[PDB]
Amino acid sequence: TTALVCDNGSGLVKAGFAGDDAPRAVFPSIVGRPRHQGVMVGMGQKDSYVGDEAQSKRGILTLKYPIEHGIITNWDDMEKIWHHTFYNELRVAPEEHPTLLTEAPLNPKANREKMTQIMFETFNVPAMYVAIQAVLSLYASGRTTGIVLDSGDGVTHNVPIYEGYALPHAIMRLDLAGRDLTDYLMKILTERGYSFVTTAEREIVRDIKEKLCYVALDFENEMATAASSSSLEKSYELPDGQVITIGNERFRCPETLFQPSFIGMESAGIHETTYNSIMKCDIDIRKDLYANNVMSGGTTMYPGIADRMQKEITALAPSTMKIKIIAPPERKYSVWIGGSILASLSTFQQMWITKQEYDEAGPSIVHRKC
Amino acid sequence: TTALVCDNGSGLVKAGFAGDDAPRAVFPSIVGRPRHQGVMVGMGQKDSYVGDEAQSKRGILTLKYPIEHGIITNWDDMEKIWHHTFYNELRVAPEEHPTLLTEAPLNPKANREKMTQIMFETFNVPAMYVAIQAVLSLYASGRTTGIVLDSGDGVTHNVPIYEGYALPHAIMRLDLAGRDLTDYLMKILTERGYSFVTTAEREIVRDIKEKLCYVALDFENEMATAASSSSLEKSYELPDGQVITIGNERFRCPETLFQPSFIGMESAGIHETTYNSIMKCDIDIRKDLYANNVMSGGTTMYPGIADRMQKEITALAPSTMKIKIIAPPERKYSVWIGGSILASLSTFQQMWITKQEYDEAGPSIVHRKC
Amino acid sequence: TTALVCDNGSGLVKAGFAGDDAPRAVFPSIVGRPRHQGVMVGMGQKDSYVGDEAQSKRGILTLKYPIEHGIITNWDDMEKIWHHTFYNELRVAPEEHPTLLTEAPLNPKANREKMTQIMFETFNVPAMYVAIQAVLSLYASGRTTGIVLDSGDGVTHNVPIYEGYALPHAIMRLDLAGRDLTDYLMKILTERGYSFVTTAEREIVRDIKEKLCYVALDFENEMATAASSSSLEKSYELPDGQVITIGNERFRCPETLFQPSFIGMESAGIHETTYNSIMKCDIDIRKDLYANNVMSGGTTMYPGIADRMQKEITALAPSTMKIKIIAPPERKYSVWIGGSILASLSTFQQMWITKQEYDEAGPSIVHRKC
Amino acid sequence: TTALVCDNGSGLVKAGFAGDDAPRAVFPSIVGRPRHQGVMVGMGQKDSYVGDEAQSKRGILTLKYPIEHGIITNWDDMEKIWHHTFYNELRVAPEEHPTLLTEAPLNPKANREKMTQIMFETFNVPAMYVAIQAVLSLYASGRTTGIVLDSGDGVTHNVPIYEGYALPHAIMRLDLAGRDLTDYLMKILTERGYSFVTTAEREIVRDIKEKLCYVALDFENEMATAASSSSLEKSYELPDGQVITIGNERFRCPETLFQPSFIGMESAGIHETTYNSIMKCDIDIRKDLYANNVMSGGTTMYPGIADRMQKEITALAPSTMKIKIIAPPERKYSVWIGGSILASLSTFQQMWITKQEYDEAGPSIVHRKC
Amino acid sequence: TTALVCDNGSGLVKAGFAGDDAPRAVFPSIVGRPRHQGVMVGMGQKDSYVGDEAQSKRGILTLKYPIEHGIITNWDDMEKIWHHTFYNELRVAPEEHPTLLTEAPLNPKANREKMTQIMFETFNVPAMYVAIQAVLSLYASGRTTGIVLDSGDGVTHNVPIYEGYALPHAIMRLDLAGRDLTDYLMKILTERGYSFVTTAEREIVRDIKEKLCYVALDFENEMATAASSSSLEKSYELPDGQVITIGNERFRCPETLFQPSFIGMESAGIHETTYNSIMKCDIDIRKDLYANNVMSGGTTMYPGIADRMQKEITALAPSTMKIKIIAPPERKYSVWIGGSILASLSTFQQMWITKQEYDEAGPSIVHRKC
Amino acid sequence: MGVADLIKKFESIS
Amino acid sequence: MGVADLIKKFESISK
Amino acid sequence: MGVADLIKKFESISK
Ligand SMILES: Nc1ncnc2c1ncn2[C@@H]1O[C@H](COP(=O)(O)OP(=O)(O)O)[C@@H](O)[C@H]1O
Ligand SMILES: Nc1ncnc2c1ncn2[C@@H]1O[C@H](COP(=O)(O)OP(=O)(O)O)[C@@H](O)[C@H]1O
Ligand SMILES: Nc1ncnc2c1ncn2[C@@H]1O[C@H](COP(=O)(O)OP(=O)(O)O)[C@@H](O)[C@H]1O
Ligand SMILES: Nc1ncnc2c1ncn2[C@@H]1O[C@H](COP(=O)(O)OP(=O)(O)O)[C@@H](O)[C@H]1O
Ligand SMILES: Nc1ncnc2c1ncn2[C@@H]1O[C@H](COP(=O)(O)OP(=O)(O)O)[C@@H](O)[C@H]1O
Ligand SMILES: [Mg+2]
Ligand SMILES: [Mg+2]
Ligand SMILES: [Mg+2]
Ligand SMILES: [Mg+2]
Ligand SMILES: [Mg+2]
C-alpha cells in the first residue's frame, strides 16, 4: 500500500499517489445544485453535481465553493468532494492507504480537528497527516533555505525557513489572492460595458483572467501607453459566440497584488510584505534569505510577475546585496509535488498519526504533530 | 610519541602539536543550542553544534560561552569542546600523546581538579600538566626576566619574574578583559541608533571592535578632535547590507582598559596596576624589571595600545629609569608559542603528572606539581 | 508662570500642569490619514485628524503611530501632536511656560537633539528639559532607594538607584512592550477563527487586552486547568455587535513578558533582568535594593502581575533575603506624577536650559544635562 | 577644663575624655568619596562623608584610608577626621580642653611636627602632647616593667622597659599588622572561588577575619587535620544573602604573623623578634623581663596568638627562665586606657607643651618632649 | 711554589698571592640562598650562590654573612668561601702552596683550632699558619713601633707593640665597627621617611655610607650648622630611580665610634681606648708611642677620623709629648699588604706549621706556634 | 497610599 | 528533476 | 622564533 496526498487548495484540488512526479486528478472543487424547474423524466436528474462534471454544466445549476480563504465554511458539501475524489478519480479504498493533507499557516484550530475526525470516523484510513503548504513547497525545489510565497484560490503566506528550522514569528497571512482578483476583474469590466453577475459568469471571468492578464514591469508607462493609441487590446470570444476586447484592464487585474488600495485593504502588496517579513528575522540570516524566493501556486503563474518581484525587492533592500528569484515553470503543482517527497522519504514514515493514537487521544492529538 | 599543547583560553581555544611554531586549529570556544522549533523531517539537524561551524550559522543558535573570566562554569559542553578539538580538529587519539593545558593565575582550586580528573579518567591520556598562562608567555620572548601582561578575553594579570623565579606576592588580576569590552562597545553603540541584543548579534560586535578600534595616544586631546567633523568616520558593513558609521566611538571602547571608571569598576586600569605591581617587588629588581614588559593575549593587538602604555609608565615612574615595552608582532598566539616549547624542552619532561602517580593519589595531586 | 510636563511615551501622551496630581489631557498619540475616496464637497473632510477625536473615527483612516520603541521615527506628525496638545487640550502659549519632557534611557542621542531643538526654534519656550523616564517614577513613590521597572508600551528598562545616585553601568533595557504584546494577542487570536489585520482593527485588540487579560500566578498549572472544561471563557462585544469568547488565550498574552521565547527573542523575561540587573551592583547594595521594586507604566496594570513578579524573584534570590514589590494603584500615571513633583521643587529650577544658553551653544547642550 | 585623649590609631580611631576608663566614640577612620554620577536633585547628598556613617554607605562610596603603616599620607582628609571627632562626635570645642595624641615609635619626623602645627594653629587648643604608642600601653596595666607588643592595622613593635627607662637601641618595628591579614586573606579566599576587589568589599573581609579566624596552637598538625574533612568548616552570611564556607583558610590567614614567608616579607615573625629584641638588652635584665609581656592592640584579639607565644618563646629562650604572657581581655582599647590615666596623673601637668612655648619655637619644639 | 695569603676579614675577604703587592680578588664574603619559589624549568638556577655573583642578583636571595665580630658562626658556608676563592676566583689548587690566614686578637680558641683543621683535613695543604691582624698591619707600614687600630665590620682593637714585643696585657677590643654603623644608619635613616628592612637593602646602606659620610671635627658646631640649612644636604640615587637626601644624618652614622652612647654600649669611644690602652703600658715607652698610631681597616676611611684622632688625643695626653697619626691612603688593604710581606721574609720560612707536625699533635698544635 | 504633595524638599538639603 | 530523483537528494543529506 | 639552540633547547646553562 502506498500513501495519498490531496493538496486541497480552495480551487483546483490536486491529488495523486506518492512517489509520482505529477498529480493524478485535478478538478474545480465546486458543488452544483439545480435551481430551475426541471420537468423531464428522461434526464438522469441527480441532486448535487460535483467536480468538473458540474463545471461542464454551469448555466443550469448554481456554484458554491466550500472553501473560502483557506478555511472550510461548510462541511457536508466538502465531504462529498473527498468522497467523489476517492471513488471516481481514483477508485481506491481510503482505509487501504495512508493519506497526507495540506493547509495554510495560521489556520483556525477548529478547522484542523474536524478535518481529522472526519478523515477517520468516515474512512478509517491507517494514518493521516496535515502539512503546512509552504513547507512542502520548499521540499519541491529541493532546497533547505528560502522564503516560500504561495498564493492561489485565495490565501497568501510568506514563510521563511533558514535550515531545517522555520521561524514561526515571521509568517504573514493575507486574504488578497486569486479569488478577489477574479471578483475585481468582474467589477472593472463593467466600465467597458459588460455584465457578469451569476456564478456561471465567474468561471468565464476566471478563464479570461488565466490567459489575457500579465503583470506590468512598470505600471504608469503601461497606463500611459495603453491609454493613448496602442495595441494592448486583445480579442476574446465568449463560449456563446460573442467577442470582447480588454484593452487596458488586463494588467490592472494582477496589479492589485502590489497595491491593495485598489480594493481598499490597508495592508501592503506582496512586494512589500516579503521584505517586511525578512526583517523580522535575525541579521546573520538575511544574506541567503534574500537569495531564495521560491514561489508556488496558481497566482504565481502570471507572465510578468517573475520579474516585477525582482525589481521591487531591489527597491527596498540594501543595494549591495544580491537577489535571486526561483520560479520553476512547473510550479502549478509545487504544493503537491513536495507532498510526495515528504511522504516517500524514509525517516518521515514514523511522523504519522495511526488510528491507534487517535483512539486514545481523540482529534486533539494533531496539535503536537504539525 | 609527541606532546600536545591546547591553550584553553576563554575566547578562541588554541591547540597544536608540541614543537612546531604555529598552532594547528583555532576556533571560538562556543556551544550551539538550536531554539526555534524546526519542521523539516528530511534534513539531519544535529542536536547541538560546537565550533567554528556553530559559529558560521549564528542564525538559529544560542551561543553560550562555557568559560567566564578564566574559570569553567558549564562542564558538559566544555567537555564536548575537548571531544571536538581532539577528534574532528586533529584526528589523533588523546591516549597516544601526553598533553599540556594552560590556565590563568589565581583561579578556584576546584577548577584545576575537575580539569585533571576529566582529562585523565575520561580520555585515558598518559600524562597531563597545567601551567600558568603567564610563565608560558615569557618563554615566547625567550627572556628569563620581565613582567608579563597577558590578557586575552576574560582575564588580565601581571606576573613579575626576575631570574627564573616568580614573585607570588605581586600577581595582580582584573576582570576587565576583552569580553567585557564587547559588552561596553555594544552599549555605546546604542548612542548612534543601532541596537544589538541577541547573542548572535553580540558576536558581530567582536567582528568590529577587533578591526576598527585603536587606542588614543592621548584621550582628552583626541576626543576633542573628532568632536568637530574629521576623518575619524569609518563605515563597516554588516553581513546583511546596512552599514554603520562609528565616528567617535571607535577610540572610546579600548580606552576602558586604561579607565575602568567607564564600566564603574574601582580598580584602576592596567596603566596603573603594572606600575603598582612592580613596586611590590624589591628595590634592586626594578632596574631591569622596568625594561621588559612582554605583552601577550588577544587584547594586546590594538594599534595604539603598544604606545599609550609606554607613554603612561614614564609619566609616573622615576624619570631617570628607562622603559622598553617589548611587544612582539604575533603576540596573539604567544601563550601557545610558549607551551609548544616548554613541552618539547628536554629537562621539563620530568615534571609531568603520569597516570601512574595520579591513580594512587587521585586528582588532588595537581596542587603540588604546579 | 507655571511649568508644563508632558511625558510623551509610546501610547497615550500624557500632559498636565505642574503641582497637580492628575494630568489635564490623556489621548492616544496617533496621526490620522484618510485613505478612501471621499465624495461630498460640503462636508469638510480635513487633511489629517489627530488625537482621540481621530481615534473616534477609526474605519476611515490609517492609524500610524509616530513613536516606535522609545525613539521618534517621523517628525512632522509628531510635531502635530505637540501642536495639538498646546492649542486644543491646554490652549496655553508654549513660549510663556517652562516645559519638561521625558524619554527612556539609552536612546539614540540624535533623538534628544532634534527634540529640544524643535522645542525652541518652533515654540520659543523659555526653557525646556528632558529627564530619565524612570527616575521621575521613583520621585513619585517618594523613596530614594529602589529599582524602577517602567515598561509602558514602548520599552522595559530597570534603573537601580541606591541613594540619590544612579548606576549607569547596570541599567538594562528590553525592546518588548504592550505594543508588541498586542501583535501577539492578534496572532494568537487567529487560532480561534477571528481576524484583525487593518490598523483600525488593531486598535480594537488593544482595547480587549486591557479589560480581559490577567497573569497566571503559575503557568503550567493554570493552563492545564482551562484546557479541560472550565469557566475561564469570557465574552467581549465588538462595536459591530457580535461577540467573541477568548477561552484560554487570555493569560497567554501577558505571559510573553516572562518568556520572550513565544516570539523568538533571545533575551529572557523581566523576572530575569530585574534579578540579573541587581547582581551587577555592588554587594553592600543588594540588601535594601532587593526590597523596593517600584513599578510603573501601563503594561504593569495587569491584575495578576503584582504577585508573579514577587514569586519569580524569590525563586532565584537567596532565601534568607526578603523581597517586597511596591505597586501603587495609580501607577498608570506614575511618570507624569513624578515629573510634576520635579518642577514643583525649588532646588531644581536651576537645572533648566535657558533659551539664551541654547542660542549660545546650539542644541548640543542637552548632552550634559541628562 | 579637663584633658582630652584621642589615640589616632592607624585603623579605627579611638577618642574620649581623660580620666574616665572607657573611650567615648570609636569609628573606622575612613573618608567617603562618591564615584557614581548623581541624578536626584532633592537628595541631601554631601560631597564627602567620614566616619561610621560613611561606613554604612559602602555601596556608593570609595574608602581612602588616611593612615598607612603608622604614617599620615593624606592631610586634608585626616584634618576632617579630627574635626569630625571634636565637633560631630563629642561636641566639645577644643579651645576649652588640652589634648593628648598618640603615634607609633620610629615614626618619620616630618609627621610628628606637622601634627602639632595643625593641632595648634587650626584648632587653638591650650596644650598638646604626643606620646609613644607603646609606653602608654604599660601605664594601662600599671606594671612598670615589661615588653609591650603593639599591633593592629599598621605597625607592630616591641619596646622593652625595665624601670621607667626605655631602651631605644632595642625597639623593633614591622609593617605586618592586621591590614595585610585583612588583605592576605582576600587573596587566598580566591582559592575557594569567591572574590573581592572593590574597596567596598575590602571592608567586608575584615568583618570575616574578625569573628572567624583563630591562630593554631600547632600549625602543621592542624593542616593535615582539616585536610581530611572535619569540624573546622564554618559559614558566614554576607549582607546580601549568599553564604560562604571558609573551611581551612581561617587559621592560615591569621598565621602570617608567625611566618611572614607567606607574603614574601623577609624579617621573621613576631614569635622571633620579641625574643630577638630582648637579647639586645643587658644580661642582668632578661632574667626578669621574660616574665612580663603585655600584648595590646586590635591584632591580638585572636583565640590563638594570646597563647601560642607562650609556647613559642619557650622553644627559643633557655628552659630555666619563667615565661608569662600578660593579656588583659580589654587590650583592644589598652592603648587608650593608658593614655587616659597619664593625662589625669598629677605629677605630669608640667611636661605638656604650652601654646606659649610653641610660639617662640614653632613646631620644632616637639622634638624635646618625647 | 709560592705561598698564599687570604685574609678572612669579616667584610670583604681579601685574597692574593704572596710576595706581590696587591690583592688579586676582593669580594663581599656573603652566602645567599633563594627564598622564592622557582618556576623556570630550563633555567639552571644553582642552589647557593657565593661571592659578588651572589651580590649581583641581590634581589632574590637572602645574603647571610658567616662572620660576626671576628668569629665564625656557620662553617659549611665558610667552607664554600675558601672553596670559592681557591678554585673560582684564583684557579689555584691549595696543596701547591703554603697558606697564611689572619684573625683578630682574643678570639675563642675553638674558632682558631677548627680553622687549621679545615685548612688541613679538607684541602690537604703543605703548611698553614694564622697570624694576628695587627702585627701584620705594622709590618706593612714598615715601622717596628706603633699602636695599631683596625676596624672593619666587626672588631676594633688596639695592639701596642714597642719593638717586636707585644703587650698582651694591653690589647683592647670593641665590637663597634662598620657593621653596626651600617646597621645604625639604617635605623636613624627611618626618621626622614625612608625605610629598609630586608637584607637586600642592608647592602644599599653599606654603599651610601661608604661614599656619603664623614666624621665631624667639632660635633655641636656641625649640628647647629647643618640644622640651619646649608650645603650639607647631599643626594644619592638608589638602584631603582628615586633619590634620597640625607641632609644631617651623614655625620652621625660615623660619629658613633667616638660616642658609643648612641647605641648604649658599655664602653667608651676609640678616642679614649687609644689613650687608655697606652696608659696600661710602662712609663718609659709612652713618650715614644704617642707618635706612631698606624690606622687600618675599612672604617678608617672617613674624611674625618683620619684627623679627628690627632685632635681628641691631645685633649687627654700631656701637652709636651707630641701626637703623630699615620694613615696611608691605601690602608683599606694594608692588613693584607703586611700579610704578603711576612710570607717572603726568609727568616719566617721556618715558623710555619708543617703538615707533618699537625699529624702527631692534632689541631691543638696551632696554639704554641702562634 | 501616597498623596498629591508628598514631602517637598524631602531630604532637606542645605 | 523528478520527485523520484529528489528523494535521494534528501535521503543522502538526511545523514 | 621556534629555534633550537636556546629557544627549543634553552641555552646550555647547566653551568
Ligand atoms: N494561466 C493562469 N494565469 C494566471 N492565473 C491562473 C492561471 N491559471 C490559474 N490561475 C489562478 O490560479 C489559481 C489556481 O491555484 P491552485 O493551484 O488551485 O492553488 P492551490 O495550490 O492553493 O490549490 C486559480 O484560482 C486561478 O485564479
Ligand atoms: N585583530 C584583533 N584586533 C583587536 N582585538 C582582537 C583581535 N583579535 C582578537 N581580539 C580580541 O582578543 C580576544 C581574543 O582573546 P584570546 O587571545 O583568545 O585570549 P586567550 O588567548 O586567553 O584565549 C577577543 O575577545 C577580541 O576581543
Ligand atoms: N487595563 C489595562 N490592562 C492592561 N494593559 C493596559 C491597560 N491599560 C493600558 N494598558 C497598556 O498600557 C500601555 C500604555 O502605556 P503608556 O502609559 O502610554 O506608557 P508610556 O507613557 O511610557 O508610553 C498600552 O500599550 C496598553 O497596552
Ligand atoms: N573582633 C576582632 N577580632 C579580630 N581582629 C580584630 C577584631 N577587631 C579588630 N581587629 C583587628 O584589629 C585592627 C584594629 O586595630 P587598632 O585598634 O586600630 O590598632 P591601633 O589602635 O594600633 O590602630 C583591625 O584592622 C582588625 O584587623
Ligand atoms: N667608601 C668607604 N668608606 C668608608 N668605609 C667603607 C667604605 N667602603 C666600605 N667601608 C667599610 O669597610 C668595611 C670593610 O672592612 P674590612 O676591610 O672587611 O675589615 P676586615 O677586613 O678587617 O674585616 C665595611 O664594613 C664597610 O662598612
Ligand atoms: Mg490556490
Ligand atoms: Mg587567557
Ligand atoms: Mg506610560
Ligand atoms: Mg597603632
Ligand atoms: Mg678589613
Residue numbers in the entry:
A (entry chain I): 1489 to 1858
B (entry chain E): 745 to 1114
C (entry chain G): 1117 to 1486
D (entry chain C): 373 to 742
E (entry chain A): 1 to 370
F (entry chain L): 1 to 14
G (entry chain N), H (entry chain M): 1 to 15
What did the article's authors report about this structure?
The cytoskeleton protein actin can flux between globular (G‐actin) and filamentous (F‐actin) form, and this polymerization cycle is coupled to various cellular functions. The structure of actin is subdivided into four subdomains, SD 1–4, and contains a central pocket for ATP and magnesium ion. The presence and absence of γ‐phosphate at the nucleotide‐binding pocket induces conformational changes that leads to opening and closing of DNase‐binding loop (D‐loop), respectively (Kudryashov & Reisler, 2013; Merino et al, 2018; Chou & Pollard, 2019). Here, we describe the electron cryomicroscopy structures of phalloidin, lifeAct, and utrophin bound to F‐actin, providing a comprehensive high‐resolution structural comparison of widely used actin markers and their influence towards F‐actin.
LifeAct is also known to influence actin dynamics and can bind both monomeric (G‐actin) and F‐actin (Riedl et al, 2008) but it is unclear how this occurs at molecular level. To gain structural insights into the lifeAct:actin complex, we determined a 4.2 Å structure of lifeAct‐bound F‐actin. Similar to other actin markers, binding of lifeAct to F‐actin does not alter the helical symmetry of the filament. LifeAct adopts a helical structure and binds stoichiometrically at the SD1 region of actin monomers and the carboxy‐terminus of lifeAct extends toward the D‐loop of the n‐2nd neighboring (barbed end) actin monomer. The helical nature of lifeAct allows one to orient its hydrophobic residues, V3, L6, I7, F10, and I13 toward the actin. Complementing this hydrophobicity are cluster of hydrophobic residues Y143, I345, L346, L349 and M355 mediates lifeAct binding. Co‐localization with the SiR‐actin probe showed that only residues that mediate hydrophobic contacts with F‐actin drastically reduced binding to F‐actin in cells, thus validating our structural observations of lifeAct and F‐actin interaction. The striking preference of phalloidin over jasplakinolide F‐actin thus strongly suggests that lifeAct preferentially binds to the closed state of D‐loop conformation of actin monomers in F‐actin. Our work here describes the D‐loop conformation sensing by lifeAct, which presents lifeAct as the first bona fide sensor for the closed D‐loop of actin.
